[PDB]
Write a protein that binds this ligand. Sequence first.
Ligand code: COA
Ligand code: COA
Ligand code: COA
Ligand code: COA
Ligand code: COA
Ligand code: COA
Lengths: 252, 268, 255, 247, 240, 263
Amino acid sequence: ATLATKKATLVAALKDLQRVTVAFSGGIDSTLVLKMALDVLGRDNVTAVVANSELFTDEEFDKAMSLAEELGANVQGTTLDYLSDDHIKNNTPDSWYYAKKMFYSRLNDIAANNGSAAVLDGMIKNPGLKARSEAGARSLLQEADFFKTDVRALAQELGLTNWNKVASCSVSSRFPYGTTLTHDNIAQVMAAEKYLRSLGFPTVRVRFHNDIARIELPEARIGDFLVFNDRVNRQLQSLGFRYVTLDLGGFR
Amino acid sequence: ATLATKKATLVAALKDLQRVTVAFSGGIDSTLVLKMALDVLGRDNVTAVVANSELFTDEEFDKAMSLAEELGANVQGTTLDYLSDDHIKNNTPDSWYYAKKMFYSRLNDIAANNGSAAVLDGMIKKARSEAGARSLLQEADFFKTDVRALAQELGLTNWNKVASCSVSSRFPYGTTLTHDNIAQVMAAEKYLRSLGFPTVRVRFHNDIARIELPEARIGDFLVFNDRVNRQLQSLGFRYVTLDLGGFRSGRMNDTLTKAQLATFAASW
Amino acid sequence: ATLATKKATLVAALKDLQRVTVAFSGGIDSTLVLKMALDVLGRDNVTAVVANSELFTDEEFDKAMSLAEELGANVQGTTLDYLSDDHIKNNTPDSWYYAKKMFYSRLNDIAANNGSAAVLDGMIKNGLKARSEAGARSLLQEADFFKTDVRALAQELGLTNWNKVASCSVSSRFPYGTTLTHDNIAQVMAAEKYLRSLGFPTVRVRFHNDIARIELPEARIGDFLVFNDRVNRQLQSLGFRYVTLDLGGFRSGRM
Amino acid sequence: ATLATKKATLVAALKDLQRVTVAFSGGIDSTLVLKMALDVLGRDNVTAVVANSELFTDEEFDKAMSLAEELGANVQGTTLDYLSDDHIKNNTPDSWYYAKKMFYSRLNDIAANNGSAAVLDGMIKNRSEAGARSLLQEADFFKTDVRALAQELGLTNWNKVASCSVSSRFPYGTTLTHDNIAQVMAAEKYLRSLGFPTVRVRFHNDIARIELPEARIGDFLVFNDRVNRQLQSLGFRYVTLDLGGFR
Amino acid sequence: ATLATKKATLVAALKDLQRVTVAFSGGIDSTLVLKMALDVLGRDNVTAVVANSELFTDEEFDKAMSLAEELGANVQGTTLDYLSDDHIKNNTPDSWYYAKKMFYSRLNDIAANNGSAAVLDGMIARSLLQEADFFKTDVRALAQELGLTNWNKVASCSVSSRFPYGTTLTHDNIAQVMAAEKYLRSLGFPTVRVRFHNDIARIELPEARIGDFLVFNDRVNRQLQSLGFRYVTLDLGGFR
Amino acid sequence: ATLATKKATLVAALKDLQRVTVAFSGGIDSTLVLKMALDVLGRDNVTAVVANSELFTDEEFDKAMSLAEELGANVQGTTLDYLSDDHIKNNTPDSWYYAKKMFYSRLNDIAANNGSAAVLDGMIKGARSLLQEADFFKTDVRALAQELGLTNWNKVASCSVSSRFPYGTTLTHDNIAQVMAAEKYLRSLGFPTVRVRFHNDIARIELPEARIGDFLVFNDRVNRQLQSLGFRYVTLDLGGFRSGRMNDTLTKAQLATFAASWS
Ligand SMILES: CC(C)(COP(=O)(O)OP(=O)(O)OC[C@H]1O[C@@H](n2cnc3c(N)ncnc32)[C@H](O)[C@@H]1OP(=O)(O)O)[C@@H](O)C(=O)NCCC(=O)NCCS
Ligand SMILES: CC(C)(COP(=O)(O)OP(=O)(O)OC[C@H]1O[C@@H](n2cnc3c(N)ncnc32)[C@H](O)[C@@H]1OP(=O)(O)O)[C@@H](O)C(=O)NCCC(=O)NCCS
Ligand SMILES: CC(C)(COP(=O)(O)OP(=O)(O)OC[C@H]1O[C@@H](n2cnc3c(N)ncnc32)[C@H](O)[C@@H]1OP(=O)(O)O)[C@@H](O)C(=O)NCCC(=O)NCCS
Ligand SMILES: CC(C)(COP(=O)(O)OP(=O)(O)OC[C@H]1O[C@@H](n2cnc3c(N)ncnc32)[C@H](O)[C@@H]1OP(=O)(O)O)[C@@H](O)C(=O)NCCC(=O)NCCS
Ligand SMILES: CC(C)(COP(=O)(O)OP(=O)(O)OC[C@H]1O[C@@H](n2cnc3c(N)ncnc32)[C@H](O)[C@@H]1OP(=O)(O)O)[C@@H](O)C(=O)NCCC(=O)NCCS
Ligand SMILES: CC(C)(COP(=O)(O)OP(=O)(O)OC[C@H]1O[C@@H](n2cnc3c(N)ncnc32)[C@H](O)[C@@H]1OP(=O)(O)O)[C@@H](O)C(=O)NCCC(=O)NCCS
């Protein structure tokens, strides 16, 4: 029941596996898995893998690569071509599952090639985990009954203080279901959001409605936002939008 | 030349025509034509026609009807079905012309049936030329200042100060107008006007409403965001948005970014 | 004295003059003078004159020209070169008087050339030496019109339209002793014209050399925020180095 | 039906009366009635009356007195004693009835003494007083007809925003006093001078609860601290803004 | 006063006390005392006590309970019945004294019963952080140095301050104020007071946030009316 | 390349020096240098110096003094008389160099007297800037600072008050105090990043643009406060603090032209 029993379950699971490939995103969870894997198995027995793709930003990729490096892991980036799957390309309500399918298939290929006994990810005890289970990836924190409070507890005891505090969210969510994602309109959404964040709005969505951008901001930020209206209008128009709008309902 | 000669040209054209039908909107221009026609020819020699349609509000029609009655004209309301023309229903870039054609075709029928010698409208300084409609203020070289001068001299003080625009302008070209989405746009704009924003547009982008406000009002508007969101969603929009460029985008920008906004708008 | 008596005095004075030139600004006072002149003497015996100059906006000039025509007057624009007078150019407390002198001197020339018996202005009762020295007549003042009598006769004549936002000389944007130049005048005039175009009809761009100090009514400053960057860049393109908003609001100083 | 017909009804009614006393408030409605009475009957057959009282601002009284002269009327100010009636002083939902009673009783006394055939007020269509003729209402004037006829007569000057009876700033069952009335009156006068012509300072003893039109609240923030200190110096302990806005 | 001297001063003081009960609120300060006490004395010689009561939010109790368990302490919740004291119930200007009395009496009773030598708190009943001359900045230095990243960042105050002196506190009106403030915080205003004036709610916000609040005026008016206020108002003077 | 190589370059340089004096301002950069020196060389081999002057707020001098001791350094404050140099006093465009010149002369005097092999400062991307030598950019400073557990540094970054005065304006104790008091007042209202630029009878306030909407409630109090400090007109710069950094690409280019026109 205690953290010590949970940690022990995690330690013994790693020792049994001996050589692992870690799906590393930079979150606290996969940071904890990667640190435990390094401490239990040694740097030559752990491969940290960070996936680059069109649905996530270069900034989050670069941050994860640097964090794995900082922890002392051998880290390798791999590029996924999500738009090659028609379910993802056409953004069906099922697209998340096919992206997860391609993700775990790639990490399995890497693990098969480096002699790893398993792919590990950072899933915990809190569905969407269908793709992981189908590929055989192990969520050791979940197996060891780690809740979020235990992750923080163990991180503190191990002296981990550095991880990515901004949880990534697939850009697919900026597009209505049935809308076709392209290299161009994905980049236009990410470039628009990057500009808005640089203005001091870290929580933002630029929702894509063909010629319309619909900006979602937390409502308590909209009053301050007004000073930027025209600069935002023209910037996002130079990115290719015809109309730049603010959702009166706010973020979500 | 002088105002006096311009009036005399207008009087002489009316005297020659003897019996006229006047396209009356309630604006100052058609108010001047109707007042002049009544003064020169008499009530029994004038028919004022006010057209109702789906592209304009019943409030504007009712005001124009009441204004024509106030002048003492025999008034005839007529209803146009603009949506029966596929150019108008599908909102093509030439949709305005087919509306003009259908408008002047109805007025010609009314004038032919009541023995008028011409249809008159209030245009100043075209489906009208093909229809044979006469714009006597334009023929007599009246500019807007001459209209105002003659109106004041005739003692005309009551007219439509707000020239309202066809609801067609709220729909992108190629979007099909329907009875429901017209009513949706009209009710949304009416609600926003009732909140204290008399200059407003609710542009229709299917499930998105894109609200245009004069930019100096956007700060005041924030207090109403949630009520406007839920109101326009109850009218049938899924998403309710405020255009960051405001109403008449670019007209208030600095020189450089006004040119930039026009370079963008002309790329589209 | 009743309003009818004040009107009859004014009517008799116009009748005696037969033909007049009216200095017309578009304000309610000169609108009343012009309308009465038109009613008593007829449009052919009245010339309305609107003076254009560097110290007042083209918008107020254009409005006054349109208003005089809407009243039914023959109207003539005339341009004064105020900056040719060193008193006006050096922006001293007597500059206004020398401007009035050049104003009425021009109006006298117009009146002599069209056969008018007098120049009329819109002054009423409550710096008029230049008017008196020039022999210009203020018939509203002569007939004991106060501002309430002006409103009453305007109502009786059906006058409802005039310029309610009376313009003041751009010289007030410069501290005393600052030399007015064509360049710095145009800089201030263009800055204020832009700000009015944003929806702020009451505004001052105070000139502090490389600093512009914008005065707005305090109840409007919240509305202004959406325009900060465009106003900043617009006014720098007009030549200012720094574009600022006075926290004290419209006419914050005066002291 | 037409404006001209309603005007003609008004003209005929005035002609029949020959001599009237006009309850004049300075609003557009009583401005139109007063001007029509003067135009049909002449200055010597019209008496304009402006009622001053503790429940309406001295500023509106002064404006109306000046406007009545501007319209061409002989004008008489009269001061009403609303707080001398216990029904009004104790501020019940029936207070309105007793104030109207005293108002029309005074105007009727004035009219009896100058030989008027009636007291006229500015009530319009869209509620009847028996002791006064509301000729605009009898002639079926709507607010739109008042404005159209006003423009046609060249009337442009009237009180555009009536402050209305200060009794509405106090809860029912609260006793009105000269002190608390004065406190509310001075508070609203200050807020109006800042550029908010439509405002209420609702009285909750040590709390002031300010009602502004909601579209004005964003502009108001620049004044928060000055209003707070001013209304505290007038005697409120806490100065607040109602989040619901005006009404 | 190097960090090493201040830490060593505290280390020696804890070591001398052998067995401790920690008044733990979830703030960074009591978080520091608890972590240090556990490290110096061991888990089985430290009991963290978090007080539940009507004058503080259930959210703050749950977070502090969770945070202390997260650090590895044996944690014990205790319930104080503040409203049973007539001074607290009637909200006298002296009520604060009687509240502290029951709090330290309860913690003293807990400590005597489990063999603790003292009750410790996190003030910067002994405050060893205060004795070691800890400022807020050096507390921060040790927190990172010990790997501490989680604590209660918004230290609450007693709900009594929302009522004028002499007002009777009730279960209903406390719940009403507490619910109103929870709603306003959920909108993005972590520093707020809903001051209780019978049928009037008077909201205090930091003055620099009042402009941001306007978008919420109508929802807040109607929300707090459904909680029982007749009028919902914003204090023009701001928070305090 | 990697953060570890950069740290190792820094470690090797400190070991080589053996005894150092650290110019410590309280910024994250000089905090990183000081912590590294202490960890590599030991407390008895490092002296932290915080320079006070008429151009530095006493509050920032105190904060740096407290942070250096907090890190475990022997720390010594010293005051420079910048206003005794006519180039600094009359605020010429070269004032920056003469202030830095007098700064480094004082630190060199201290290092010669304490047996230090060099003076170290926190310069990044005979004074040594070891962070710059080891190729540290701002991202690497933040990353290493996090790794050592550094949590305290001056987040509201000190600049010389001279930057509030136009070139050619004479700095005095009175007008410096006027600027410092105006800025301290604004910080007390909740605006930690602020400049009160001095234009004789005009104060021109620079705020981050995302805060200007919040400022409206304080307009009258700030106007009256700064007038009592001696300004005639109290104004807000419409371009804000660090004008241009947040603009769209076109207008950022435009404002970069405007700024360059006054250089
Ligand atoms: C796992 C996945 C399917 C998304 O599900 P999710 O639970 O929302 O994803 P998370 O971002 O919480 O990632 C969980 C773990 O996956 C791994 N992971 C996620 N993104 C990764 C990346 N780019 N590189 C390597 N590992 C990655 C990590 O081990 C991570 O743990 P952590 O971020 O808590 O430290 C994602 O990997 C994917 O490929 N596509 C996204 C599909 C989606 O949006 N699903 C919605 C859930 S119904
Ligand atoms: C007149 C019309 C043909 C449009 O042309 P337009 O000249 O730009 O439109 P206007 O509104 O200025 O019409 C001018 C005159 O038409 C007449 N008119 C307009 N609407 C009228 C109505 N509902 N009933 C009767 N007459 C009407 C009036 O004489 C009016 O004079 P006014 O200045 O006093 O209002 C219009 O009546 C029509 O049939 N369809 C409008 C569709 C559209 O969008 N047209 C754009 C033109 S670019
Ligand atoms: C009258 C004058 C001599 C100064 O005296 P003043 O009473 O302080 O100035 P005012 O602005 O009140 O002008 C009073 C009258 O002068 C006349 N006047 C003022 N500006 C005028 C102009 N531009 N053209 C014609 N007449 C003008 C009008 O009769 C005006 O009456 P009104 O404005 O009350 O209707 C004035 O003519 C002058 O000096 N300059 C005129 C303004 C100008 O140069 N340009 C345009 C101003 S918008
Ligand atoms: C007029 C009164 C008798 C009540 O009637 P009301 O309809 O509530 O008030 P109104 O403001 O609509 O008054 C209507 C007309 O009364 C006359 N009137 C009102 N106040 C007047 C005053 N101070 N002096 C003279 N006439 C006055 C005017 O003719 C006015 O027309 P106008 O203001 O539209 O131009 C009011 O003056 C009074 O004495 N007491 C009102 C107190 C109250 O609580 N009323 C609640 C009723 S809803
Ligand atoms: C501690 C107490 C007795 C008063 O102290 P205070 O200075 O007002 O409040 P603090 O929150 O600073 O309490 C100091 C320490 O008490 C302890 N403490 C406070 N509330 C606690 C709780 N609910 N459970 C356990 N320990 C608690 C903690 O060690 C805390 O340290 P930290 O908050 O700095 O991390 C208070 O907790 C109490 O029981 N009643 C409040 C009395 C009051 O209203 N006082 C008004 C002051 S004039
Ligand atoms: C050192 C000085 C010259 C600032 O120049 P700088 O090197 O560009 O300034 P930085 O902000 O990069 O600081 C560099 C380092 O100098 C040292 N330093 C600066 N001010 C210091 C002070 N008052 N006391 C001690 N050390 C100080 C610190 O090591 C500092 O590291 P930091 O990044 O944590 O602040 C400054 O002391 C001075 O004399 N004037 C400041 C303004 C100026 O005109 N500078 C000209 C130099 S470009």
